[PDB]
Design a protein around this ligand. Structure first.
Ligand SMILES: [Ca+2]
Ligand code: NA
Lengths: 281, 64
């Protein structure tokens, strides 16, 4: 039997599934450590590797990209977990090696591949404390070209009044996603600042792991793919909505939580986002 | 419970490993070049050490 992880229910994805919308025909690039294409609870549609010494994007030697991919798009069947957008076309864009790290140029090459291959949504469960002009230009180019770009806010927690959101989440063109638990409390590691946009579940998130396994991970890495999956659900119900409209739909319908420095606009609600008229609940 | 080591910035990667393992003997330490991008999962057992091209600590080590 299949299980629905709590975070998929918490963002109200089952309301979209019951309407008949599951992310069909929406192309989502998971820009990450690869995706294990042999996992029976995932269907990988394509991809490419930007890691010079690891040329197969369908081999995930870290585990991280496979977990993130399952939150986006684990299949709707009688096994394992259910994803937020279980019919999405999932692309493995490998820019991190076995050790979970990548050079800025590898990340940029992945974003460029995503643009050239007409991805609808990019998820980046990755980041670092400094930007670069070249990175900003790549994310800005993707958004100018129509792509919804979602990234983890970072796991730096608080530092007084300072923002601790990392890049690329900290760029205005990118939706930066912080982590809450099942009670809607901010995770203590979740980055903070005026660049924090929305929150999603990021504590004890069950998803797919390589070699036909499942497990619970924590991080803003786990929160980001709930939002990327929600963007795929919204586009499946409204295929002509622009990235601008998908982003505003998510922002304008959150359930508001605390102060925006710590919670941004609050928890996403994909049911309210995918209606024509938007308001917060 | 110590979870960040700002006093280690500018020290050698060797001294940083020694000090972290005294405070957290089960730590899983990984050494990476400063200015790389990493996955955003949170692992309580892990301490990343970001070094400069001289192998000195270039960023405050913290658990995660
Ligand atoms: Ca399943
Ligand atoms: Na942003």
């Amino acid at each position: 039997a299949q299980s629905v992880p709590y975070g998929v229910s918490q963002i109200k994805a089952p309301a979209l599934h019951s309407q008949g919308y599951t992310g069909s025909n929406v192309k989502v690039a998971v820009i990450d450590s690869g995706i294990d294409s042999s996992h029976p609870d995932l269907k990988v549609a394509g991809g490419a590797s930007m890691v010079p010494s690891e040329t197969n994007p369908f081999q995930d030697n870290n585990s991280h990209g496979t977990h993130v991919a399952g939150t986006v798009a684990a299949l709707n069947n009688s096994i394992g977990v259910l994803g937020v957008a279980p019919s999405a076309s999932l692309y493995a864009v490998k820019v991190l090696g076995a050790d979970g790290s990548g050079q800025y140029s590898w990340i940029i090459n992945g974003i460029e591949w995503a643009i050239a291959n007409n991805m609808d949504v990019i998820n980046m469960s990755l980041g670092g404390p400094s930007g670069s002009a070249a990175l900003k230009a790549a994310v800005d180019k993707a958004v100018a070209s129509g792509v919804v770009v979602v990234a983890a806010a970072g796991n730096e927690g608080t530092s007084g009044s300072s923002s601790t959101v990392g890049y690329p989440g900290k760029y205005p063109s990118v939706i930066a996603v912080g982590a809450v638990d099942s009670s809607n409390q901010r995770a203590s590691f979740s980055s903070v600042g005026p660049e924090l946009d929305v929150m999603a579940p990021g504590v004890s998130i069950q998803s797919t792991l390589p070699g036909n396994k499942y497990g619970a991970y924590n991080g803003t890495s786990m929160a980001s793919p709930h939002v990327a999956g929600a963007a795929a659900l919204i586009l499946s119900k409204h295929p002509n909505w622009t990235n601008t409209q998908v982003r505003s739909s998510l922002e304008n319908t959150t359930t508001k939580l605390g102060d925006s420095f710590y919670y941004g606009k609050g928890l996403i609600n994909v049911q309210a986002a995918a209606q024509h008229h938007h308001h917060h609940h | 419970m110590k979870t960040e080591w700002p006093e280690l910035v500018g020290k050698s990667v060797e001294e940083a490993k020694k000090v972290i393992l005294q405070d957290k003997p089960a730590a899983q330490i990984i050494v990476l070049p400063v200015g790389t991008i990493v996955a955003m999962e949170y692992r309580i057992d892990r301490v990343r050490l970001f070094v400069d091209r001289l192998d000195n600590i270039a960023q405050v080590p913290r658990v995660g």
